[PDB]
Amino acid sequence: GEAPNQALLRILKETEFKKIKVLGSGAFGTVYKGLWIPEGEKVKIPVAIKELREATSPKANKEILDEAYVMASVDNPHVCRLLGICLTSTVQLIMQLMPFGCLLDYVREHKDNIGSQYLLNWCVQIAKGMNYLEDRRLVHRDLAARNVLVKTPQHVKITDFGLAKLLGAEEKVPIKWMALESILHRIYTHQSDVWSYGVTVWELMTFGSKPYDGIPASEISSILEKGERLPQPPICTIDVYMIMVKCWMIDADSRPKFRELIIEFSKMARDPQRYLVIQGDERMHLPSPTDSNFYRALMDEEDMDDVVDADEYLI
Ligand SMILES: */C=C\C(=O)Nc1cc(Nc2nccc(-c3cn(C)c4ccccc34)n2)c(OC)cc1N(C)CCN(C)C
């Protein structure tokens, strides 16, 4: 009883885009930072290009095209979407570049300049994107700070949809972010994503700390069974920590819904200093450059007058 998926999959020529630098390296793949120019459209679009290292793994090609399938089928401001794929010897996935990187690295880099208003706003936007995924009956199953990307300090989107799956669908795991029911019984739900959302929030509030640092994963399942949970971050009022605790309840239907988390964090974002206590909160500012020179430096391209962000390139 699911509806037909009429998303369009766009195929791009390798000549249309160029790679500038390597963002990340991995056995499965390499991610580049690039420019994409559509033919005879006179626009330059900053992109991240995802390349798996070799065609040789059957699972691997299945893996990236499943990811392309999911990214092509979502459309939301807090969800990363796919610009297209290139059918090279190895399949390339082309997605919009998020210039400020992943939220985990950003939070660590900028812990000294990050204010309560940004932290609570990121919490709203993540919840919004996750709620959109729930509307689409999509269970992410890998929600984490590392998988949230920063378009601007004001704007973040969810990413890493490779393990994303439909809700009732039959079917190096990260145990620390996982619901207990996921760990014990491979059960995955929107409400198991809510648990992962709690841990992601805890990461942001701890400015990038590692959860259960120094604890072996094999141990983690037992810890949770006892009722141990992640500790209350220093900057966190009991109101915020309590939200985190509700996401980590054993009864999964007991946990909050993403649409509720939007509401609650949004309310808090109206009086941020009442809910997060951060030294010198008022003083702090985070740089948010809109302009063409910022791109020229980032893309190392002399002429960026025709730059257009993916969000403004609509088909
Ligand atoms: C958490 C690491 C990270 O995101 N680093 C990063 C990312 C970007 N922008 C960007 N935009 C879209 C997609 C990606 C991306 C996707 N995948 C699977 C990645 C793996 C590894 C790295 C990036 C990936 N990234 C960025 O844009 C300018 C910069 C950036 N930097 C420079 C931090 C690099 N550290 C890992 C050292």
Expressed in angstroms, the distance from the first to the final Cα of the chain is 29
Residues with CB under 6 A from ligand 1: 23-24, 31, 33, 48, 50, 95, 97-99, 101-102, 104-105, 146, 149
Ligand 1 center to 218 CA (angstroms): 29
Q: What is the CATH number of the domain that holds 38?
A: 3.30.200.20
Token pair 């919490």 in the structure block, residue: 123
Q: What is the 8-class DSSP label of residue 77?
A: T
What is the tally of structural domains in the chain? 2
**Are 43 and 308 in contact, with CB atoms under 8 Å apart?**
yes
Q: What are phi and psi of 250, to 5 degrees?
A: -75, -45
The experimental method behind these coordinates is: X-ray
Residue 217 has which token pair?
């994963």
Q: Report if residue 293 sits inside a domain.
A: no
Please check whether residues 253 and 117 belong to one and the same domain: yes
CA dihedral of residues 163, 211, 175, 182 (deg, nearest 10): -80
**Protein residue with its CA nearest to atom 36 in ligand 1:** 24
3 state SS of 68: helix
**Protein residue with its CA nearest to atom 33 in ligand 1:** 101
Residue 272 has which token pair?
């941020």
Q: Report if residue 292 sits inside a domain.
A: no
CA angle 105, 94, 59 (to 5 degrees): 90
Q: What is the 8-class DSSP label of residue 231?
A: P
Residue 47's beta-bridge partner residues? Answer: 34, 96
Range of the domain at 77: 1-97
Please check whether residues 37 and 181 belong to one and the same domain: no
**Are 19 and 49 in contact, with CB atoms under 8 Å apart?**
yes
Measuring CA to CA, which residue among 212, 25, 244, 208 is closest to residue 104? Answer: 208
Pocket test for ligand 1, best of 22, 23, 155 (most atoms within 8 A of CB): 23
Please check whether residues 119 and 268 belong to one and the same domain: yes
Residue 69 has which token pair?
């399938």
Q: Report if residue 66 sits inside a domain.
A: yes
**Which residues form the catalytic set?**
142
Q: Which alpha helices (H) appear in 28-145, and where do they start and end?
A: 58-72, 103-109, 116-135
Please check whether residues 18 and 123 belong to one and the same domain: no
